[PDB]
Design an enzyme around this catalytic site. Structure first.
Site, PDB file in Angstrom:
ATOM      1  CB  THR A  90      -0.899   0.033   1.255  1.00 19.95           C
ATOM      2  OG1 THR A  90      -2.168  -0.562   0.959  1.00 19.95           O
ATOM      3  CG2 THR A  90      -1.082   1.461   1.751  1.00 19.95           C
ATOM      4  CB  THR A  91       0.769   4.422  -1.832  1.00 18.78           C
ATOM      5  OG1 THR A  91       1.465   5.677  -1.790  1.00 18.78           O
ATOM      6  CG2 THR A  91      -0.719   4.669  -1.928  1.00 18.78           C
TER       7      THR A  91
END
Lengths: 111, 242, 244, 244, 243, 233, 250, 198, 241
Positions: free
Chosen positions: D31-32
């Site tokens: 995930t960012t």
């Protein structure tokens, strides 16, 4: 020097009837000539229809009862919820107490 | 090389799966549980006529209400038995009662996955899994007569009947039909004796096979040759009689 | 992990042999030859110094004959450094025995101990074995003069005469050929030099390439004596026995 | 040859540590997440992919606090992230216990750095599968940091890692140029909510859940807190609005 | 067999490839540095490259303050450099505690070199991909420069350089000393020694520097310190008014 | 490829994967299906017990950790024993030392952290079992899903094991419905069974084959097996 | 973490070779030449200070180290390995001897200790042999002057004269020609300087050469007076100047 | 303490040890054999602390027996006593020292001579023509110093011992219930079953 | 610190290191044991790869564990020593705590356990030894003969053989040993033993040693002649036909 023990007074009584049993105890907890509490339960329901009380030095009495209750809990865990018979609890408690044979729980216990 | 506790691409532990192969090569052992007790029988399978067959001990007593049969690398089973006997006795010392058959099994199975070269979880010192499977049988007040199958995997299963060893798949299919919820101890005895006879390379006699049982009344007992021989004969008869 | 680089020095070959032990023996087989011969009145230890030089200080040198006790000495064939580790622990076992029983350690007891240590590096620990073979020459009041041998495997045996190191095959044949039970220390000394002299991979057999020792019970005394010959002494005896 | 990439502490011929690089791969696959250093604090935000309607909303929290003034968010193998915060927490507890003052952000950063770097020294351990963005306010203002699986870390004006780190950095660099005087806590919260929304394009396939936290000397008293309710929704809007 | 290239054991040629590859790692940063000795000071110049615009320039450094008197510049990846820095600080603090006086620059270098030598011999420890240059004004030796590498080797220098373009900086400095005939920069102020340092850094590298392209550390009697962007600017201006 | 990077858990593959962990996750799929769902008052665990032979028992798959917590397992049974025992200790510790029941979310974190340690160090192997934890604490009913990779997630409902995807789509559909079965455990349980059945194929859940457990507002975690579940088949 | 390398890294090959030891020897062969000559009243050890750069200070790096006031060592091979060996050697001379008997150990014994440390790195788990050969020269009351050589295997032998490293074979030959048992210390220093000249490529002066001797006691280097039995160290490192003074009459 | 006497005559060693075992106010047994045979030709008597006494003796016995089988040889009495002295000397500086005194009587088949060794709990060993432990020496040494001769026959030894025991029975306050006597010579160890009235 | 699993399972369910341990036993010199009606006889063969040994001091094959029990073996000599010691120590310990010497079965069970342990313990290889243990239980006249192997498995035999050519000599014993009537005499038992060894020794007067064990710690080994006389009377039995 430091004394690890103390006396909290109190008295307990256990009578076995033919198909019933009783365990009584005053609710007074003391220290020397002072009253710490006029109501501090000393006899406990530990499950599996077992009542117990460890009278004498309160800290030890509490530690024992607490330890025994936990023992019942694990008994169920490790033996498919098998009820702990009074005689089995008695043998169990003997080991709990003897475990501290060289720094005893300063209590007289009855179940 | 490769770790002794590595997972195969299919989600299985190599050392354990290979363990099961060694067990297949072992001597057949069969157990049947009835409401009148549990019967445990094994294939002595001596490697020579000079070997005194009764020095072959593949059926041992764990406690008066528990006994078990082994199949596979039998030498590996000594410490399992030692552990089991100690567990049962220890339990009695602490609780003034009999260890439940299931608990005793669960205790034995707890050693199972205790192998590795430094597995992070405690201190599993044992270079490999056990190369033997056990049939643990007994009786207790809560669940009566029981038969368990304990594998090197650390898992155990309860069976009404079970066969382990070389003739296992063949013998298990047999038990599937033969077993019913109302067998008598004797029907179980003859039945175990028969299945053994089918899968044994040798001609079953009271010297290369051994029976035993465990009953609430007399506990675990290993049948002496004379007692078994009479049962062999009784089997041969009932068989020739149709 | 590390498993990748583990040679596994203590495993069996499909034939049931110990790889490292076999290779250590192969290593020992290139070591200077050492000979041990037991007479009726003494023991003789002779060894060939592998590789030497004009500049090598022979007077102060020692690479094959070591004193373990006052009654025991060993002849070394293999890694000198490895040998010294064992020699030292050997010397200590002897003194522990002495301190405990107030008697000198029987020759076999000391050999079994050392051999047991070697056997260990063979079954556990994952370490390489010691590349050493020993010839023990000693005396005790229970078996008199004794001669033993131990190798990387930890196995040991007794002998009347024996050799370790290079060309042992040849050496053993030559000894088996001329050994006689009634020999005398001097007979043995001569046989030892003859054997080496014929198995040497060198030109001649000079004194600067030899180590010599004898364990006799000096008639005019009544006790046991170890004598590690000095360069000159070796030069002398070499002339007499006729090797000049 | 080859195989330089099978063991952790091994240097390849080009002076690299492949296992550490492979870890980075696990980080880029996650995930960012990001960080924004404002004029008196720092803001942390992260993308929470909604695998399905079965995930209780707002429950599976990702951001973590260390002590009372530090926030940590990470991309990659989540379990490795928690493991690293547990250490961080012990590290901060110990420091406070001996020195009384809560641990300075730079000091905390090196504690995490030294620990992570440690996992690139032996082949008996695996490097961490996460890049972490953490920070907070201390005796000398705010500090934002980002730590790589190699143990490398630096101070940042803005930081991002994970699936959409490129979009993020892009937006962050814009903010840096257009605000040389420093963004504000209030503003950074909204901005951060936007960067996450934009960066979500590299994963526009799955629906997600935004999470923001901040540590502002004026908005939180230098204590790390999560953005909830109103302030949160206000930022979700600011994003949804500028996403069209 | 081919594993003699993964752990620090000998190769048939008697080489230790892991130590060699560790040296290869020291240039990963692509940073060059040099140290020179003044009349009573030691200076260390090092390139400072900040590629990302999102970085906080103030936290990007390869120069460390090991102790009140010792300074250390590192050539190699930052995580290994910080590992070496922490250890050196610990070693220096303890030396003072146990022996009653400040740990001398050269001794600390020897201690760190010895630690490295161990990773060279023990298989489970990998070498650190860095070269450490220690500098100070030793109370007994005066201006000092000592440098250690992944081989566990270390020696004192009259001046030195490290990095991808090490050879050019070195030959430049060598030439200057063959000429001057002395083993130091005959200057009374460290400011002029820092200028000499940067001047030759430019000649040898054929590059111009702004105040943010450099990183400077200065060691003087009883104190090692690094210069600021503005302290450097003042230096840069001065060298300008001469060319 | 893979072959050279799956020898143990301390190795990353060129793409950032941990095969040993993934292989462990595979043991779960091979495990019998089990389901879990919760309203706002109760949490239910419905697990399909699997048998070896027709003479064998149907291996227990539900374990109680405390009076307010419990879990269902899919995969390596021995590992679930280890993990459930560790969980029993934490719940126990919390009560003894702090006289406080351990929060279901906290138990989740603890499990994740124990599992993670077995994926970063040499010598150990990842746990090869999946877990569904249900419990009722100071913030209501909870359902957690534990993965050997160390990932734990809070859900309204879910399922793991062989064909688990069947029941998982059902629940994800029935969501708005079952999540409101407040105050009525028997309904919730029926919903649990009407989900577990969505993953059948072989046979049809029997009396010695089905296993159910529940906990809630005023319901100490309890396990129902056999005849006690007959009224749900 | 933790060293999990508890198995030998040096093992026997089918031919009976101990590879790692061979390779260490090979590393020694590439090392700069060093030698030792024993005279009747002293010993001399010498080597070349192969400066790795003109900016480096050759003094700061000494290849000739004092182990005890009457024992010195020099080497060929891996300098860092040698450096730690010297530290261990100095410590073992104290721990395993001076602290027990109150006197420094005799040359052979210390050499024996050093050799032991090297033998272990040949068999202990997780390590590689030391890549060096040492030449230790010393003097003790009951053995007089001596010179030993210690190899990576842990082996050691006494020499009248010898050389190790790069041009050991050539140097060894040259020494066999000039050595006799009647050389005086100054004669040995001369022969040493000649032998070393052949092995040196460039500059040959007191700044490129390191040379020490074990000779008469140096009361002037004792540091104090008042104790008759203490006459000073026998070990003495020659000065750059003292070397040049001799290079002229070379 | 108990009586522990040892007399070394021409061709043998005789050990006399009291038979009483008193615990507090009662004499629990009057037939206690305070001796252990370490090897066919070596015997050890002992006295001291209640439990340590036998525990020690049996510990030594086991060790000598193990040595005998491993070497298929019998350690000389001298070797055995040196082993025992060392055990006690370790024990004296341990956490809880063995409080046991012993007499070791053996016949050295190699030297063909009897040997008597006295060793107290501190690990103090000495070889003697005769010795004792505790108060026993105090009453019997003046008699032994007087009548003892190196060439005595075993018969004369038993007579001198009898005289010692009578002196002990006359002047000692405690009733040690007589002694059990044993002889160690070239042919092993035997017990004089008739001393209750010899 | 070294704990690598050296004995592990292979795909077919085998433990190769234990399998190879047996291979080392096959390479060892032959050993045989046969029990009579009131005695057990242990015969071993002597190698001859090298002869010029000192028989007085060279370690013999049949070892005494206690005064009533002996142990012989085939395989690695060095390894056998470790087992003998542990057994001898366990024999003394048992007497010290149970106040009674060990039974032959107990002593065998012990040795076997030590062997089994070395098959599943890290950092160690199995013993390349197989043993024959025989003797008489305390206060019992019934002869005992047991056998152990690298795996840790053991059992009792009427007669048994281990080592090289054990296959051959076992056959001889299989068609020469009647459980109905076991060698009712020490003499006819020692002869049956020599006959079984001659099938493989190939004229080995000095290559054959027999040890006789009778009840109550009565153990003795024959000298060259005594044996040589048995060989003699046997070669005639053949020629006399």
């Amino acid at each position: 020097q430091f004394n690890p023990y103390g006396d909290n007074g109190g008295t307990i009584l256990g009578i076995a009837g033919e198909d019933f049993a009783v365990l009584a105890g005053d609710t007074r907890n003391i220290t020397d000539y002072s009253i710490n509490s006029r109501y501090e339960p000393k006899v406990f329901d530990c499950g599996d229809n077992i009542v117990m009380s460890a009278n004498g030095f309160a800290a030890d009495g509490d530690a024992l009862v607490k330890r025994f209750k936990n023992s019942v809990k694990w008994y169920h865990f490790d033996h498919n919820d098998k009820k702990l018979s009074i005689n089995s609890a008695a043998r169990n408690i003997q080991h709990l107490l003897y475990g501290k044979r060289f720094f005893p729980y300063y209590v007289h216990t009855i179940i | 090389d490769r770790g002794v506790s590595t997972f195969s691409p299919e989600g299985r532990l190599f050392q354990v799966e290979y363990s099961l192969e060694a067990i297949k090569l072992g001597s057949t052992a069969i157990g049947i549980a009835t409401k009148e007790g549990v019967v445990l029988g094994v294939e002595k399978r001596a490697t020579s006529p000079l070997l005194e067959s009764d020095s072959i001990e593949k059926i041992v007593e764990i406690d008066r209400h528990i006994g078990c049969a082994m199949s596979g690398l039998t030498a590996d089973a000594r410490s399992m038995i030692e552990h089991a006997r100690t567990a049962a006795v220890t339990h009695n010392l602490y609780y003034d009662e009999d260890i439940n058959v299931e608990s005793l099994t669960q205790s034995v199975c707890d050693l199972a996955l205790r192998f590795g070269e430094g597995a992070s979880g405690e201190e599993r010192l044992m270079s490999r899994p056990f190369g033997v499977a056990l049939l643990i049988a007994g009786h207790d007040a809560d669940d009566g007569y029981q038969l368990f199958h304990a594998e090197p995997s650390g898992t155990f299963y309860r069976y009404n009947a079970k066969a382990i060893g070389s003739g296992s798949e063949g013998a298990q299919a047999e038990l599937l039909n033969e077993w019913h919820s109302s067998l008598t101890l004797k029907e179980a005895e003859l039945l175990v004796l028969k299945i053994l006879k089918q899968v044994m390379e040798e001609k079953l006699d009271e010297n290369n096979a051994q029976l035993s049982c465990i009953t609430k009344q007399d506990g675990f007992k290993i049948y002496d040759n004379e007692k078994t021989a009479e049962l062999i004969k009784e089997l041969k008869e009932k068989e020739a009689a149709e | 992990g590390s498993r990748r680089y583990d040679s596994r020095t203590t495993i069996f070959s499909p034939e049931g042999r110990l790889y490292q032990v076999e290779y250590a023996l192969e290593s020992i087989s290139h070591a200077g030859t050492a000979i041990g011969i037991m007479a009726s009145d003494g023991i003789v230890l002779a060894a060939e110094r592998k590789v030497t030089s004009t500049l090598l200080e022979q007077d102060t040198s020692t690479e094959k004959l070591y004193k373990l006790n006052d009654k025991i000495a060993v002849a070394v064939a293999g890694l000198t450094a490895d040998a010294e580790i064992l020699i030292n622990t050997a010397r200590i076992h002897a003194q522990n025995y002495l301190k405990t029983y107030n008697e000198d350690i029987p020759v076999e007891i000391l050999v079994r101990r050392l051999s047991d240590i070697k056997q260990g590096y063979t079954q556990h620990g994952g370490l390489r074995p010691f590349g050493v073979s020993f010839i023990y020459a000693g005396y005790d009041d229970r078996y008199g003069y004794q001669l033993y041998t131990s190798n990387p495997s930890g196995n040991y045996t007794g002998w009347k005469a024996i050799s370790v190191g290079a060309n042992t095959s040849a050496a053993q044949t030559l000894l088996q050929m001329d050994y006689k039970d009634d020999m005398k220390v001097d007979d043995a000394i001569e046989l030892a030099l003859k054997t080496l002299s014929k198995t040497t991979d060198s030109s001649a057999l000079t004194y600067d390439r030899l180590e010599f020792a004898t364990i006799r019970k000096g008639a005019n005394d009544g006790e046991v004596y170890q004598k590690i010959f000095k360069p000159q002494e070796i030069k002398d005896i070499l002339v007499k026995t006729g090797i000049t | 040859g080859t195989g330089y990439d099978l063991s952790n502490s091994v240097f390849s011929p080009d002076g690299r540590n492949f296992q550490v690089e492979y870890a980075v791969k696990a980080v880029e696959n996650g995930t960012t997440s990001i960080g924004i250093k404002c004029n008196d604090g720092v803001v942390f935000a992260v993308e929470k992919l909604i695998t399905s309607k079965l995930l209780v909303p707002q429950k599976n929290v990702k951001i973590q606090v260390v002590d009372r003034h530090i926030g940590c968010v990470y991309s990659g193998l989540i379990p490795d992230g928690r493991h690293l915060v547990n250490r961080g927490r012990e590290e901060a507890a110990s420091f406070k216990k001996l020195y009384k003052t809560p641990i300075p952000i730079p000091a905390f950063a090196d504690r995490l750095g030294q620990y992570v770097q440690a996992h690139t020294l032996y082949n008996s351990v695996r490097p961490f599968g996460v890049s972490t963005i953490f920070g907070g306010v201390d005796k000398n203002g705010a500090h934002l940091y980002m730590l790589e699986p190699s143990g490398s870390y630096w101070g940042y004006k803005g930081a991002a890692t994970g699936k959409g780190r490129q979009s993020a950095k892009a937006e962050l660099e814009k903010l840096v140029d257009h605000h040389p005087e420093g963004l504000s806590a209030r503003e950074a919260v909204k901005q951060a909510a936007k960067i996450i929304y934009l960066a979500h394009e590299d994963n526009k396939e799955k629906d997600f859940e935004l999470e923001i936290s901040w540590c502002s000397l004026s908005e939180t008293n230098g204590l790390h807190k999560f953005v909830k309710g109103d302030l949160l929704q206000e930022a979700i809007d600011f994003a949804q609005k500028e996403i069209n | 067999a081919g594993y003699d290239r993964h752990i620090t054991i000998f190769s048939p040629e008697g080489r230790l490839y892991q130590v060699e590859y560790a040296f290869k790692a020291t240039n990963q940063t692509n940073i060059n540095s040099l140290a020179v000795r003044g009349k009573d000071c030691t200076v260390v110049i090092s390139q400072k490259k900040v590629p990302d615009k999102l970085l906080d320039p103030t936290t990007v450094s390869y120069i460390f303050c090991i102790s009140r008197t010792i300074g250390m510049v590192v050539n190699g990846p930052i995580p290994d450099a910080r590992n070496a820095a922490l250890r050196a600080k610990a070693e220096a603090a303890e030396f003072r505690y146990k022996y009653g006086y400040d740990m001398p620059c050269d001794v600390l270098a020897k201690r760190m070199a010895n630690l490295s030598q161990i990773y060279t011999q023990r298989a489970y420890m990998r070498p650190l991909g860095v070269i450490l240059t220690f500098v100070s004004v030793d109370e007994e030796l005066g201006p000092s420069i000592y440098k250690t590498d992944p081989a566990g080797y270390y020696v004192g220098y009259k001046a030195t350089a490290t990095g991808p373009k090490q050879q050019e900086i070195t030959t430049n400095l060598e030439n200057h000393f063959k000429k001057s005939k002395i083993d130091h920069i005959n200057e009374e102020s460290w400011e002029k020694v820092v200028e000499f340092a940067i001047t030759h850094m430019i000649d040898a590298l054929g590059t111009e520097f702004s105040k943010n392209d450099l990183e400077v550390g200065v060691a003087t009697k009883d104190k090692f310190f690094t210069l600021s962007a503005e302290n450097i600017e003042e230096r840069l201006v001065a060298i300008a008014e001469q060319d | 490829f893979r072959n050279n990077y799956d020898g143990d858990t301390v190795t990353f593959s060129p793409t950032g994967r941990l095969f040993q962990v993934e292989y462990a996750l595979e043991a779960i799929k091979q495990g019998s299906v089990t389901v879990g769902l919760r309203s706002n008052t109760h949490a239910v665990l419905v697990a399909l017990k699997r048998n070896a032979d027709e003479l064998s028992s149907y291996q227990k798959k539900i374990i109680k950790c405390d009076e307010h917590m419990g879990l269902s397992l899919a995969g390596l049974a021995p590992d679930a024993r280890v993990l459930s025992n560790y969980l029993r200790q934490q719940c126990n510790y919390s009560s003894l030392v702090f006289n406080r029941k351990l929060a279901v979310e906290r138990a989740g974190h603890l499990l994740c952290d124990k599992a993670q340690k077995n994926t970063q160090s040499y010598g150990g192997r990842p746990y090869g079992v999946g877990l569904l934890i249900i419990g009722y604490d100071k913030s209501g009913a909870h359902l957690l899903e534990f993965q050997p990779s160390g990932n734990v997630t809070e859900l309204y409902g879910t399922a793991i094991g062989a064909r688990s995807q069947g029941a998982k789509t059902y629940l994800e559909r029935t969501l708005d419905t079952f999540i409101k079965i407040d105050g009525n455990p028997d309904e919730l349980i029926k919903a649990g069974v009407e989900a577990i059945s969505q993953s059948l194929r072989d046979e049809s859940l029997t009396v010695d084959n089905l296993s159910i457990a529940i906990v809630g507002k005023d319901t100490p975690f309890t396990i129902y097996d056999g005849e006690a579940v007959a009224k749900y088949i | 973490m933790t060293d999990r390398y508890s198995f030998s890294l040096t093992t026997f090959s089918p031919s009976g070779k101990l590879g790692q030891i061979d390779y260490a020897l090979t590393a020694v062969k590439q090392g700069v030449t060093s030698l030792g000559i024993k005279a009747t009243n002293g010993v001399v050890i010498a080597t070349e200070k192969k400066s790795s750069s003109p900016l480096a200070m050759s003094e700061t790096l000494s290849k000739v180290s004092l182990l005890t006031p009457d024992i010195g060592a020099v080497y060929s091979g891996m300098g860092p390995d040698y450096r730690v060996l010297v530290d261990k050697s100095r410590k073992v001379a104290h721990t395993s001897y001076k602290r027990i008997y109150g006197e420094y150990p005799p040359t052979k014994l210390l050499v024996s200790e050093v050799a032991k440390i090297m033998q272990e790195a040949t068999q202990s788990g997780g390590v590689r042999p030391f890549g060096v050969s040492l030449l230790i020269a010393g003097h003790d009351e009951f053995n007089g002057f001596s010179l030993y050589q210690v190899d990576p295997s842990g082996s050691y032998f006494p020499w009248k004269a010898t050389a190790i490293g790069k041009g050991s074979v050539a140097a060894k030959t040259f020494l066999e020609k000039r050595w006799n048992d009647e050389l005086e210390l100054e004669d040995a220093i001369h022969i040493a300087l000649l032998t070393l000249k052949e092995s040196v490529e460039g500059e040959f002066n007191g700044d490129t050469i390191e040379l020490a001797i074990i000779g008469d006691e140096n009361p002037d280097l004792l540091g104090y007076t008042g104790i008759p039995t203490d006459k000073g160290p026998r070990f003495r490192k020659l000065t750059s100047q003292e070397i040049n003074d001799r290079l002229e009459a070379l | 303490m108990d009586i522990i006497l040892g007399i070394r005559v021409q061709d043998s060693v005789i050990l006399a040890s009291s038979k009483a075992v008193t615990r507090g106010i009662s004499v629990l047994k009057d037939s206690d054999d305070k001796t252990r045979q370490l090897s066919p030709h070596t015997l050890m008597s002992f006295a001291g602390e209640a439990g340590d006494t036998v525990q020690f003796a049996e510990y030594i016995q086991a060790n000598i027996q193990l040595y005998s089988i491993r070497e298929d040889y019998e350690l000389s009495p001298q070797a055995v006593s040196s082993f025992v002295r060392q055990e006690l000397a370790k024990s004296i500086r341990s956490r809880r020292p063995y409080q046991v005194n012993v007499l070791i009587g053996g016949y050295d088949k190699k030297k063909n001579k009897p040997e008597l060794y006295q060793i107290d709990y501190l690990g103090t060993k000495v070889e003697l023509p005769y010795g004792a432990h505790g108060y026993s020496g105090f009453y019997t040494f003046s008699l032994l110093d007087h009548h003892y001769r190196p060439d005595m026959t075993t018969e004369e030894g038993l007579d001198l011992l009898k005289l010692c025991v009578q002196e002990l029975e006359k002047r000692m306050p405690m009733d040690f219930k007589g002694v059990i006597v044993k002889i160690v010579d070239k042919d092993g160890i035997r017990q004089v079953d008739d001393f209750q009235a010899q | 610190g070294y704990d690598r699993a050296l004995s592990i399972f292979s795909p077919d369910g085998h433990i190769f290191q234990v399998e190879y341990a047996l291979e080392a036993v096959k390479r060892g010199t032959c050993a045989v044991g046969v029990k009579g009606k009131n005695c057990v006889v242990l015969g071993c063969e002597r190698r001859s790869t090298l002869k010029l040994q000192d028989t007085r001091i060279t370690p013999s094959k049949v070892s005494k564990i206690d005064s009533h029990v002996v142990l012989s073996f085939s395989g690695l000599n060095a390894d056998s020593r470790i087992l003998i010691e542990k057994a001898r120590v366990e024999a003394q310990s048992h007497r010290l705590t149970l106040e009674d010497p060990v039974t032959v079965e107990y002593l065998t069970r012990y040795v076997a356990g030590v062997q089994q342990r070395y098959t599943q313990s890290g950092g160690v290889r199995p013993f390349g030894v197989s043993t024959l243990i025989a003797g008489f239980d305390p206060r019992d006249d019934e002869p005992k003969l047991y056998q152990t192997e690298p795996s840790g498995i053991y059992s009792s035999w009427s007669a048994q053989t281990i080592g090289r050519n054990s296959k051959t000599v076992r056959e001889f014993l299989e068609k020469n040993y009647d459980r109905k009537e076991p060698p009712a005499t020490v003499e006819e038992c020692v002869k049956l033993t020599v006959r079984s060894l001659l099938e493989v020794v190939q004229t080995g007067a000095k290559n054959i040693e027999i040890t006789v064990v009778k009840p109550d710690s009565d153990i003795v080994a024959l000298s060259s002649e005594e044996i040589n006389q048995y060989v003699t009377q046997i070669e005639q039995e053949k020629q006399e036909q």
